[PDB]
Structures are given as C-alpha cells and as structure tokens.
A and B are shown apart, each in its own frame.
Chain A
Amino acid sequence: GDELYRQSLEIISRYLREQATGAKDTKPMGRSGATSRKALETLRRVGDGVQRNHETAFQGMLRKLDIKNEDDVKSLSRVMIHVFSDGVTNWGRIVTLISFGAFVAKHLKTINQESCIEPLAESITDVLVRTKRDWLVKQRGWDGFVEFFHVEDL
C-alpha cells in the first residue's frame, strides 16, 4: 500500500477524532510513530491555535458549507482543491486545512454525525497525498511538516 497515504490518514484521523471527542486515542502508533507523534504534537499546538485565533472565520465557513452528511464532504473537497488553484502551496495552508477539518469534526459530533468524520479525514488526506502529492514529497512529507513548525528551545 501507499505509506504516505497511510501515515497521513492516521495523523489526520487521530487529530480530528481527538478534537471531536476531547479524548486522546491511548493506543500508540506503531508505524512511523516518532514522526507521527511529533505531527500530532504539532497539530495540537498550531492547529488548536488556528481554530482559536480564527474562530469567527471558521464559524462563517461552517455556515456557508453547511456540512451535515457525507455528500456534503464532496463540497469541502472541491473547495480545498481550489485553494491551491492560485498556484500557491505552503505548510500554512496545509495545517489550516487540517485545522478547519477538526473544527468541522467537532460540529459533526454535536449533530450526531460522527460517522462522517471518516469521509472528512479521507477528503483532507486526499488533497495532501494526491492533489498536492508532488509538493508534499519534495518538502519531506511529515518530517518537513514537523520541521517547519518546530519550536526552538532557547
């Protein structure tokens, strides 16, 4: 199988689910776990901050997109793909997609649509490992993600 897919899906799914439920998945990741653990640390730190700093904007998007079922996720997919149609790709945009995914996942849980978190996570994963796969690989994948957002200890 596609390891970039597998790792990306695991990281993104784990973040979205722990955000939605308020509880960490206690079973450690056994494959590329060191990098994936650092990626989750990074998402809690940066991703939680994106949602807090931009809560009003995120609420506006939630309202516009009206995501309430799996069919609606197709709409988010088209939106995310077209983010990159201005020719710009960067880690800020990538983390922002995952952050907004968490924001949507929380809302899905409140309307008893936890089942749609799987298609949501798949849609975001697909933007990274299909639509922008070449860029993601050139940028060293999740090790690159972790490096970009790392905190220097002074």
Chain B
Amino acid sequence: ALETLRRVGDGVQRNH
C-alpha cells in the first residue's frame, strides 16, 4: 500500500 501511494502520488505530481 505505501509503495502504491508513492507511485500514484508521484504520478499525480508529474501530471501537474
């Protein structure tokens, strides 16, 4: 879960 939150979160960061 924490790895998934990091991955999703870093992807949101890149998108914006």
A binding-site residues for B, Cβ under 8 Å: 46, 50, 54, 57, 60-61, 64-65, 79-80, 82-83, 86, 88, 90-97, 100, 148-149
A60–B4 contact, CB under 8 A?
Answer: yes
A64–B1 contact, CB under 8 A?
Answer: yes
A65–B1 contact, CB under 8 A?
Answer: yes
Total residue contacts A-B, CB cutoff 8 A? 58
B binding-site residues for A, Cβ under 8 Å: 1-2, 4-6, 8-16
Knowing A64-B1, A65-B1, the reply to whether A54 touches B16 (Cβ < 8 A) is no
In the bound complex, how far is the Cα of B1 from the Cα of A79, in angstroms?
Answer: 7
In the bound complex, how far is the Cα of B6 from the Cα of A83, in angstroms?
Answer: 6
Q: Output the least CB separation between A128 and chain B (Å).
A: 13
Q: Output the least CB separation between B9 and chain A (Å).
A: 3
A80–B5 contact, CB under 8 A?
Answer: yes
Knowing A61-B1, A82-B2, A83-B2, the reply to whether A54 touches B10 (Cβ < 8 A) is no
* Shortest Cβ-Cβ A-B pairs, 7 listed: A92-B13, A93-B9, A92-B12, A96-B9, A92-B9, A61-B1, A90-B13
